[PDB]
Amino acid sequence: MITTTKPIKAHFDPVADLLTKINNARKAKLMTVTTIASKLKIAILEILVKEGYLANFQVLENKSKTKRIVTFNLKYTQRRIPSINGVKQISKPGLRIYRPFEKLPLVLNGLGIAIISTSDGVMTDKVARLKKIGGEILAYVW
Amino acid sequence: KRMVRPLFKRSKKYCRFCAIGQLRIDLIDDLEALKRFLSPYAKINPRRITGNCQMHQRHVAKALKRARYLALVPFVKD
Amino acid sequence: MQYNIILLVDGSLSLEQANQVNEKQQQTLTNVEGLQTEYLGLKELAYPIKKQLSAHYYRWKFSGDNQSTKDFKRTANINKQVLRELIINLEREYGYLASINPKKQQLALQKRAKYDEIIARENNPENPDVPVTSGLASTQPRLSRTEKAQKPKEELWDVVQKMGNFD
Amino acid sequence: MQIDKNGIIKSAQLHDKDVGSIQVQVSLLTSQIKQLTDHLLANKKDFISKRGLYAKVSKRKRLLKYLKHNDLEAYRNLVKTLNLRG
Amino acid sequence: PKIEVKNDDLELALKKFKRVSLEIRRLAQRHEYHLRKGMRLREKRKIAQKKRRKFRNMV
């Protein structure tokens, strides 16, 4: 099991909340962070660990089943330098970014990953190209 | 007459009421105590001389000014 | 409500000033509970208000509604001696909720008791008190703190999904 | 004077232990409004009370807007009892 | 500013009376020219800070 001691808060926008958490942990060399858990945030973490930027992401629930928090860690090498270099969100609240498949972006000439949630949850840019279907663009991660 | 004692502690003494935990000030319950905090020249001594914390200093100041109005203490030397 | 008047009357003679206090009591106080009174005595006040260097001191610890003040405050100047009068409403004085709080009252008693033991040792009858420990710092921490230390509301969480947990 | 909050809450409660609903706050708010208009009319130079009075009026208006948006029928019930509209 | 002469010596009395007069002269010179509330508060804070820093190292 895993216990905590501190209150867990989150910003209302679920993509940039994670991005701020990730960037601060990367810059400060921190390892364990916490945030509130949402299915969109859970799903985006699902595609990241298959692509390999973070190691683990653990979501827990209360004894009443009314609140859940996901606690993820970053993948630092032995010399303590991260795998994430920079994250940037495109479709911020207010101005939502919609690009068709033909205009699907390529992040850092394919080195980075672009998060696109077309119709079956989040999916990396390359597999989105494979399926020839596009849609919502969440964030740039490299 | 002569000063009761020196600053056996650091450069400061100690807030009396805090140790006794008096928690309450009435002008006819520790009247003789308040004349101590007052300087000989009928003037409210500052922290460096009086030794109380800010709250008890503020509490004593209000009580002493209240006592000054009830005409129980002098107001100035001359 | 609970008020507290501190009357000042001329120093003519004690019984007749007591009668003046009784008159001042039964006339005003529109609605009132028991009006217990004390008699601090004759004192030579510092500044001679109205060139008066004496006075009988009375203290009233009544309690009642807010209307008990208006007539008395007016009757006072319309009255005789009554050099001064102060209605110190103790619900606004510098510290009243703590004084009513029971735990703080009991807490104050042990400190009174305990502080007195230290002062005794300092001023020993005749044997020299080498420590002269009073204002100075104490010994090791108050173990009771370490023992009775609070426990934060440590929310327990239950695992649901996993994958790649280096653990 | 400080309104006997207990009696007004006991009157406006829909069911016991419901000391934090929307109806009890607006019922309490109207009482605070009544007292503050009296106090401010007497004084006419206290502006902190004026700021508080305006804030309480706005909070009551916003609370009534929410309770009108959801379950409008109970909003009608509350308004006829409280007589706050006019 | 009552100071007893004690009639034992004279100098010592003036050694205490000098002190009484300096703190007296401070307020006497303070209450000679009219300053705005902002300048008066500024000068009040200035005197306390000057005295403080000196007291910090006096030990």
Add this chain to the structure above:
Amino acid sequence: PVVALCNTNTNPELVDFIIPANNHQPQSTCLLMNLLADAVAEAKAMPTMFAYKPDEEIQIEIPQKKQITSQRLNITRNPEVLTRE
């Protein structure tokens, strides 16, 4: 490969072979510098002075000028940087 005896106030990045130890005690300090000197002496064929040695020959004394006090005080010589106007 500079080696150093960090004493709680050092940046670990600059040093390579960090040797967590004291630096304010004239006994701990003296023991460790000689220990590194011992590695040199041992390879230099000289008989060791403190390394690989028993208790009786390691005993050392505390220099002059209850327990020893390795406390940092003297805080009063750090007032606010001269300012004011």
Add this chain to the structure above:
RNA sequence: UAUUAAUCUAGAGUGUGGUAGGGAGUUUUGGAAUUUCAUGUGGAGCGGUGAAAUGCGUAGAUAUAUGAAGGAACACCAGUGGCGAAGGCGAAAACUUAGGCCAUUACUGACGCUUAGGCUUGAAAGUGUGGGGAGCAAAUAGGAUUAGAUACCCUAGUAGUCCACACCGUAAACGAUAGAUACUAGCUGUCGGGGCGAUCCCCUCGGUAGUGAAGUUAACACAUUAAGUAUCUCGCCUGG
């Protein structure tokens, strides 16, 4: 994402329980100090300045002692401080009243952030009416200084500074830094609530400061109270 039909409490509020405040308005009260007047003593200057001169004084000034009247502001306390959204708040009391911090096994169940237009407040000066006027002093008069002085100095001096009711709505109204939300080393202070129980000190939750790395900046510098990593909303900028 938007719409609709519903559930939940973690956001935000409410209640209970602890609790700190120069928060505000209305009505009374008090003492120093100045001025004027009244009564004594007294006998030649006082006053003012860089130096003086207008000025006051044998009609007895300055000074000293007592008393009376009146107006304005509230020494010390008073701060390596407190409160309020800002302007601001410091003699004492009563009444009315605003917000805030801590703990909540309680309650509603997203009711929240920003805000064009609108409303409220908003230093001092200024206005209108009626009072008040001790001290101070724009305008003004005189004496100085000066090449000249409509200025800096001095002696007088009205409006004004004060109160009530009506306006005016500007300030370097400054933290020269809009509000809200989440995260990001540490150290030293200080204040409040809570936990222990002599203080002192330890821990927790907040407010107010100093130092300080990553980080940011053109640099100065900011640095958990950001000018750092980011979002929402409003206002504003486009050479002199």
